[PDB]
Nucleic acid binder design. Structure first.
Ligand code: ZN
Ligand code: ZN
Lengths: 56, 56
DNA sequence: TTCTGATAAGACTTATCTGC
DNA sequence: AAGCAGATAAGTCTTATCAG
């Protein structure tokens, strides 16, 4: 998280790690990634509510 | 396939098996399913091009 | 502490397989 | 044969984690 920063795309404000869009504008991990792979914004419709944990 | 039938949601016209929306209107397998689980239309943005095969 | 990449967990989509 | 509704999985894709 962080105070004063919102996802420039999914607009969420709680994302493990923040990244930057190809415009220097803050984006939540999901988004940041999704764009790097689809070179198109992140269809906000798959905007999930909470965040999942994971395992190694 | 089938002549004269288009996906009432994803508009595709090639879907393994056709289903019906809760309005009796033809829908391609993906859609038909996605709605039964999300009780909301199928975000067309995840409209895939071709169709994948699978294995058992 | 910040942020970009690479890796890979396993959540979701949706093709199949059945039973009407 | 045909058309459709439900269940059950199958990898595909999304995306939390791990490094640099
Ligand atoms: Zn976002
Ligand atoms: Zn459809």
């Amino acid at each position: 998280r962080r105070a004063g920063t919102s996802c420039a795309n999914c607009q969420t404000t709680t994302t493990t790690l923040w990244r930057r869009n190809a415009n220097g504008d803050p984006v939540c991990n999901a988004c940041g990634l999704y764009y790097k792979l689809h070179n198109i914004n992140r269809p906000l419709t798959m905007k999930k509510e909470g965040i999942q944990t994971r395992n190694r």
